[PDB]
Every structure is written in C-alpha cells, then in structure tokens.
C-alpha cells in the first residue's frame, strides 16, 4: 500500500508516534517519505547482504528475520515480511524500539541527511489530526 501523507500521519499518531522520545510527528512522516516514498512494500538490499524493509526501511541486520542475513539479530522478534503489510502496526512498534536504543532518529540515514534540522512540521501541515 502507498499511503497518502496525511493518511500516514493519522495512522502514526493513532499508534503513538507523535512526540515519541521527543520526536514530533513531522519527523516520522519526513523519514517515511525519503526512506520508502510512503510505500509499505519497499525493499532495498545493503552492501553487506542485509535488506531494508517497509515504510521505515527497517534493516534485517538487527531488527527482523528474513532467513538470508547470516549472523544477524531479530530484535523486534518479527519476520521481515511483516514489515511489508498494509497495516503499519509492526513497523511502528519496531520503530519505537529502534529510536529508543540511544541514537534516536539518527538510525535512519535519510532522516539525518534530509529531515534533521529542517522545518518538519511542514510534513503534517493541512492534515486533520
Ligand atoms: Cl511536527
Ligand atoms: Cl527524492
Ligand atoms: Cl537470517
Ligand atoms: Cl534523541
Ligand atoms: Cl531533501
Ligand atoms: Na535478522
């Protein structure tokens, strides 16, 4: 499923991401835009052989099991394919773990390079929230 911007914002807010660990909602929408273009089925292979999955491009090296990243962990205790669902529950619950781990949203390279330090509230402007 390819979400609309405000559709995704509302879904994220219902699932508790607004101001989660101090990150206002527009940070999360900005990160989803540049990680996956709001597409829950996005996948991208990394040079080490791990894969990024779903709307927030969560990496199989640490966070989910895809059966083909030897040596990796599964810290969100989920098959990576769950992160591709049209229901973003699994992606959000796993993101809450990632952002809690000490590096904050710097875990998402696109957030650091394209969202951090910008006017992120722009991403939720016009939405009924
Ligand atoms: Cl915001
Ligand atoms: Cl772009
Ligand atoms: Cl594996
Ligand atoms: Cl932080
Ligand atoms: Cl940009
Ligand atoms: Na893994």
Curated annotation (Swiss-Prot):
Cross-referenced PROSITE patterns: GLYCOSYL_HYDROL_F22_1 (PS00128), GLYCOSYL_HYDROL_F22_2 (PS51348)
GO biological process, one term: defense response to bacterium
Active site residues of this protein: 35, 52
Broad class of where this protein is predominantly found: secreted
Tissue: In the egg white and polymorphonuclear leukocytes.
Gene Ontology CC terms, in alphabetical order: cytoplasm; endoplasmic reticulum; extracellular space
Pfam families according to UniProt: Lys (PF00062)
Disulfide bonds: 6-127, 30-115, 64-80, 76-94
The entry's keywords: Allergen, Antimicrobial, Bacteriolytic enzyme, Disulfide bond, Glycosidase, Hydrolase, Secreted, Signal
Domain of life: Eukaryota
EC number(s) reported in the record: 3.2.1.17
Cited InterPro entries: Glyco_hydro_22, Glyco_hydro_22_CS, Glyco_hydro_22_lys, Lysozyme-like_dom_sf
More details: Lysozyme C is capable of both hydrolysis and transglycosylation; it also shows a slight esterase activity. It acts rapidly on both peptide-substituted and unsubstituted peptidoglycan, and slowly on chitin oligosaccharides.
Function: Lysozymes have primarily a bacteriolytic function; those in tissues and body fluids are associated with the monocyte-macrophage system and enhance the activity of immunoagents. Has bacteriolytic activity against M.luteus.
The protein's assembly and partners: Monomer.
Homology family: Belongs to the glycosyl hydrolase 22 family.
Protein name according to UniProt: Lysozyme C
Organism for this UniProt entry: Gallus gallus
